[PDB]
Structures are given as C-alpha cells and as structure tokens.
Write a protein that binds this ligand. Sequence first.
Ligand SMILES: *Cc1c(COP(=O)(O)O)cnc(C)c1O
Ligand SMILES: *Cc1c(COP(=O)(O)O)cnc(C)c1O
Ligand SMILES: [Mg+2]
Ligand SMILES: [Mg+2]
Lengths: 382, 381
Amino acid sequence: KSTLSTNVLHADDAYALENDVAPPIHISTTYTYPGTPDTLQPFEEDFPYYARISGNNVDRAEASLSSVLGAPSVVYSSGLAAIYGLLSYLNPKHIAVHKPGFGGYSGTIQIIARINRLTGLETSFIDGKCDAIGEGDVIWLETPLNPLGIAFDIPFYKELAKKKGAILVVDSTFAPPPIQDALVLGADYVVHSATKYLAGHSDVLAGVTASKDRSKILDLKADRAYLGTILHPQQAFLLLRSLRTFPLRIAKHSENGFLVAQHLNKLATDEQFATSLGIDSSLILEVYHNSLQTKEFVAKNLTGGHASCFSVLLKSDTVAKHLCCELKYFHHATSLGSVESLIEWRRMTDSKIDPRLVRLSIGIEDAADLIADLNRVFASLS
Amino acid sequence: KSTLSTNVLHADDAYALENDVAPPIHISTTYTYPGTPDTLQPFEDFPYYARISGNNVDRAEASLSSVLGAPSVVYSSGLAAIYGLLSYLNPKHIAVHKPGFGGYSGTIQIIARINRLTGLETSFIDGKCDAIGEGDVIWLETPLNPLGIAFDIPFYKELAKKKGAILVVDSTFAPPPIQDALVLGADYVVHSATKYLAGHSDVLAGVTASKDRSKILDLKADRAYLGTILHPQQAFLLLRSLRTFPLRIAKHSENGFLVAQHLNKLATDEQFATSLGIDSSLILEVYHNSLQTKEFVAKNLTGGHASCFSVLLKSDTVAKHLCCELKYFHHATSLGSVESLIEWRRMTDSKIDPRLVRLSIGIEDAADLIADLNRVFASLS
Ligand SMILES: *Cc1c(COP(=O)(O)O)cnc(C)c1O
Ligand SMILES: *Cc1c(COP(=O)(O)O)cnc(C)c1O
Ligand SMILES: [Mg+2]
Ligand SMILES: [Mg+2]
C-alpha cells in the first residue's frame, strides 16, 4: 500500500534497537553476551555479536534496500564483492556475458577469470541464443549496458534461461527501481553496485544482491561471513542515509538523462538546430541511449524512466579531450550515479577502445544548466 | 544564471584543494606551514588550525552562501549562531515573540545569559516595538516555532529602519527558496541547519548570513574565540546534505501544504470527515501559513509552504494517542527531518496548552501520511 518514498524512510523502523531517530553507528566489532550465570544459555550465521558476521547497521540498510528492490537483499563491501559472492555461490560450468569490445563492466570479466583459475568456468557471449548455456549455468545480463546506456530484453533472456535450466542474473546498476525492476521482469538474481545510484554521493563503496528466493539470500549471507565482505557499520550508516533521498534523486537523474541524451541526439541529427546554437553537428557522430533504441521491448523493461549514464561517439579524439576537460558542471572522472555530473574519456583506462567515445553520467543539476554547458563547449569547437 | 539545484552541487568547486569528487574530510586540527629555510617568511582566515578556519567549513559555507544568496558563517549549532550574533550586536533592548504565544525557547535562554552580562532587556513583538531604539534588535522568528504561521518581514524592516534598529530573522522554518528573508529586508538571517538544511537528524549546525560581508567577517573572527566553529566531520555531512537540499525542500513544502490542507478540511468540513469515519470536532484548529488570510503571507513565503506547524486538538487525550499511534510519525522533538515527526508540546513546556501538537512533515508520500492520520483520527471517533 505505501509507496517507495515512504518505504525507504520506514522499512527499517522495525529493526531499530533504540529510540534514536537517526540510526546510531554500532561501530563495535564485538557485543557482550546477555545473561547471568543461571540464565547463561549456550547457543554462526545470524550470530549478532560480531560485526563481520551480522550487524544492526547492515540489518537496517538491508531492510531499506529490500524495500527498494522488492525482495530479500544482501549487502556487501562493494559491487564486485557482491558479484564474486554470487558467482562463487552459483559455481556454474558456463557463463554468458556481453562481448568485452561491445561493453559490460570489465570488473565482471576479471572476476570470471579469478573463478576460472579455481573451477575452469567457461565464458561464452550473449547473442540471443546462448547455445553453450545449460542446466545450472549462468546468463549474466548487464542492462542497461556499461558504458553505452542501452537496454536488453530481460523477459526474453528469462525465457531462454528457463528453457535451458539456467540462471538469469541481471546486473541492473544503471537502472534501479523504479526505473527498471529486473526481478519482476524475471531475473533469478539482481545485482547492483550501490556505489553508484543507491548511495549516490561518491563516498560509499557497496554492493547488493537480491532474489525472490529468500533461502538463497540466506546462503549468500552465510558465505559473506567467511569471504569477509560484509558492509561495515560506518558505510552501512552512510548507505542508509543516502537511501532516504534515493526516490527523489533517481527521479531527477532519470529526467535529466532523458533531456541531455535527447538534446545531444538532436544536435547530432538536426543540422538546423545545431546551427541555431552555433554548433557544427558533425562534432557528434552518434548518441547511445535507451530512449534512442527503436525496439519495442525497451520501454517494457525501463518502465519507470531512463538511463542517466550513456555514451557519445564524437568526431575525433581531439573533440573528446576538449569536451572532457572544458565542461563547468561535468568533472572528468570515473564512476557514475553521483549527485554531480561526470564525464569520462573511455580511452583513458583502455587502450583498445575507440578514442572518440566518451561516457556521460548525468547528476541532479538543473538540466538546462547541463545543456547550456554542453552547448558552450560544442560551440567553442565549431 | 545557474539555478539552485546546480549551485548547491558546484558552488564549492572553486574551494576544492584536491581531485577528490566527494569532499575529503580534512579532520586534522593542524596543518604544516609551507616553506623552505630560504623561502620561509612570517605571515578569521588562519587556515592552519581547524578551530579558526578549515577547508570543510569553507566548502560548506560556499554551498550555504549559494542557498542563502549572501556571505554565510557556520557554527556548531543554531544556538551557537544565535549567541554569537546577539553577543556581537550587544543590544540594550531586544523584541521577541511573547513566550506563551511562540518562539524558540533556546533563544529566550540565550537572552537570559546575555542579560546576566549586559542587562539586555526584553520586550515583545507587537507591531509597534516602542522599546526599540538605535542599535537595538527586533528578533523576528518567522515562520514561528511551533505554529508554522508567518509574520511580515518587510513591515518589521520598515519599523527597524525608522528606529535605527537591527532586524534579525530566524528563518529556520522556511529556508530559500521557500522564503528569502534577506531579500525581504532582514539585516541578518539565522538558521538552525540542524533542521532542513542538513535534514537527516544527524548534524547539529547553525548558520548566519547577511548582505553585509564586513559583519560576517566580524562574526567569523568572534567564532574563532568563542570556540563555536563547525568541526570538519560535521561540515562534511552538512555539505553532503546540501547536495539534496533543493529536492528535499521542494518535497517538504509540497507535503506540508497537502497535510495541513487535509487536516484543515477534516476540521472545517463535517461531511468529508464523516465520509472518512472521523469526528471533525477532534480538531479545533490547524495553524499553517496557507490558512492565514493576510495578503503578506504569500509575499513572504514566495516559493512554498511551511512543513512544521501545529494543530490544536479537542483534548490532551487526543494529543497523546495521536503522538503514540501514528505509523509514519515518530514522537520526538526537532523538525526538518526526512522522516515525519510529531511532538506533544506539553512534553518540552509546562506552560503550553496540552491540546497542542506540532507536526514536522518529512519527505514521505503525502498520501501515506494522510492515510496514517486518517486511521488514527478514525480510531478516536
Ligand atoms: C561500477 C560497477 C560495478 C562494480 O561495483 P563496485 O562497487 O565498484 O565494486 C558493477 N557493475 C556495474 C554495471 C558497474 O557500473
Ligand atoms: C531548533 C531551533 C533553533 C536552535 O538550533 P540548534 O541547532 O538546535 O541549536 C533555533 N531556532 C529555531 C526556530 C529552531 O527551531
Ligand atoms: Mg524511523
Ligand atoms: Mg565538484
């Protein structure tokens, strides 16, 4: 009955151990045992007395996260910690991922290599078929895709996974609910880097996995106790603080992402519009964004908004470098999902990638200011 | 040119000393002097000791000044800001809202501590302020804690100007863009940033601003010796909060309007109330700026509405049940939090009407808050 704005604020009320309005930071590693000599009662998976196994700050953060995700959730010290935990738990023989040249988070490929070192896990590529995938194998669908910001059809891959007896994991980092609900669309598990949108202020590393199957999430929590990857109390406090404003922030990100992507696409494709702004439309070759895909499934996947991190292919590496250095409201930096807008020249970190490609992460500024900034730089290059 | 949503995010860009996207916490009390033996030369702006000045405070003040439209000085609490301002102005006379009608009780306690030192005398804001003369202070808290009703800032500025006096507005209940007390003519504006500006009930902070930068520099110098600077960790959290302040304050204002309007409808429309299972006589009066019939209110609150306001109920029994049985309102003091709060005022004050409750509307979906209130009022009918 209550909606997201209310639930992020009150989902943890039942988990409060004290009268503090803001959650306390239960920073202690260890907690004294209750009980007297007579009542002292010998009894570790829900052991609440050691913070590397379980803790109140994590409990409250997971309550709020589960309200966002609509399912039992397990929170980790980073997105890659969540991914490593999930893939080591599932222990598939085969995994299908997006081909690395096309896109997909490089850290996921590095985790697959580290698991392959141990298990021989074999990689194939997502191709609409996934012939190599069988029973207990994993389809790892990252959508929207890092760095392009375009979407894939989750229900389609759920039907493939179902036919094959395989497991569909969606890395939904670029579109958390309410923009996309990967679990409702059929994903067996969903993973997010909460470092990005959910925390949102570039000051928390965190990962989260969710599933409608609570017993699997409990297994993951048990494993987390020994992989050593629980989110610590101080970070769980800041993550929970962020979640309080997540419904407001994510709505603004989505609106801004649509507006900025659409403006850039209009510049690239409408020579009269560009000229009206003092801009040579040839500076932008292509804009990638979910709103520019012509496929009907995209609006059935991203039911509640738009990606705010997406890429642009520019005319040259010169244009890309000027754009990354000269914007007033976009800092040249990696990561995404921050309150402030960011831009990244993808070639910085990757020698194989086309030096014309830049990735934008739209923050919660006034879109008219972001568009005026972009216009100023593009005009200076015309 | 750029608007508030952009400015709270970028006003501190020029004060960044490093490439960190999120501000670092420069927690150190002390910082090494630059210089070699050949280049070493002797020198409110000493940057090498955090109790005088610091980078986290600089960045927080840059963002605050963007919100407030004027140079700002940040303190360890709202009362630290008020004590700093009143001890700097050192008036012989001050006019305040009558205790009993409203006004923050801590301000009265500060006046008592300053009176102990100077003999500062108190009179009451009454539309005339006869006792107030040159250099004296009109202390106008608007919207008023706990009622949530507004007073006419330009009227009191005209009164102060005629007398040679100083108009201070405590604008805690309505920060910009809801109200801009300085544009309306206040000589100084004070906020408890503990409330809306920080907004998550986990930062104590105060802020004073003025169009006159010399006064703010004097306040910063005094702050260095009164010992009331905001510390680095708190300045970090306040700046973090300020990034979402424009979204939060718009939601607070919309919700406060909706909830006050609903409770007023329940109190003044017996049919509606009965259609909800509710006895309209349970609510005597709702106090809110949107219910005031004077023309000046919308000229002061130009960009929104109060979200902390009071309701006079039929009995203290009704008040206590409301305070204890709401799902989305915690029974606690303070206001301006993301979560909705309610307070039975008789808890903090033995002289106030036991029928009065103060509501602080958070950033929930207002339809859930209204449904919660409806459920409790129906259960009392
Ligand atoms: C950033 C990111 C990750 C990794 O998260 P960390 O918190 O950085 O470990 C995983 N997936 C996607 C899509 C990401 O963007
Ligand atoms: C809470 C409050 C203050 C005092 O602020 P602290 O941060 O609590 O010291 C001052 N004025 C008003 C109107 C307040 O509500
Ligand atoms: Mg609560
Ligand atoms: Mg910045």
